[PDB]
Ligand binder design. Structure first.
Ligand SMILES: O=C(O)C1(c2ccc(Cl)c(Br)c2)CC1
Length: 167
């Protein structure tokens, strides 16, 4: 039993809700919140910009030190950093950005990072400003993630479309 509330159950391990991931993280304080990161951990907009804003820029400060030490992530890769006031940990995951020409096949590799964590609060990878079809992202999530994932979808219209079209 966990504290996630109001989710629709899609499969044995995947759950979904129309919610602002920032507000959901502040309420649940999950062990892991997933960020929709880029390779530079520049949290400018989309989910990343919103999460970073909620940390009063502490996420960005920590991320800049991470990059200075380690260099950029790979597309499809991830790193674990602090969750600050939102979660115990933040798993920064880089899905391919279609608006940069990146290979959509890398979306499966991106979701594989979730399997290293038993339970996660997450957005749909490569959705929103990353330019992929969120219906496809949900399909890849369900077919790749085996651990327990709670998906927050900000847009109500999109949430209803994802549910109504789910096979
Ligand atoms: O939750 C949402 O509405 C969606 C999303 C996902 C990731 C990012 Cl980065 C942004 Br922006 C938006 C899925 C469309």
């Amino acid at each position: 039993v966990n504290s996630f509330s109001g989710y629709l159950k899609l499969t044995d391990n995947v759950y979904i809700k129309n919610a602002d991931i920032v507000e959901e993280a502040k309420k649940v304080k999950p062990t892991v919140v997933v960020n929709a990161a880029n390779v530079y951990l520049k949290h400018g907009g989309g989910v990343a910009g919103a999460l970073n804003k909620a940390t009063n820029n502490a996420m960005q400060v920590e991320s800049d030190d991470y990059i200075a030490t380690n260099g950029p992530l790979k597309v499809g890769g991830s790193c674990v950093l602090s969750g600050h006031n939102l979660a115990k940990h933040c798993l920064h995951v880089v899905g391919p950005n279609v608006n940069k020409g990146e290979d959509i096949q890398l979306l499966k590799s991106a979701y594989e990072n979730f399997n290293q964590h038993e339970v996660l609060l997450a957005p749909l990878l490569s959705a929103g400003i990353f330019g992929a079809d969120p219906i496809h992202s949900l399909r890849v999530c369900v077919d790749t993630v085996r651990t327990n994932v709670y998906l927050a979808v900000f847009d109500k219209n999109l949430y209803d479309k994802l549910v109504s079209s789910f096979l």
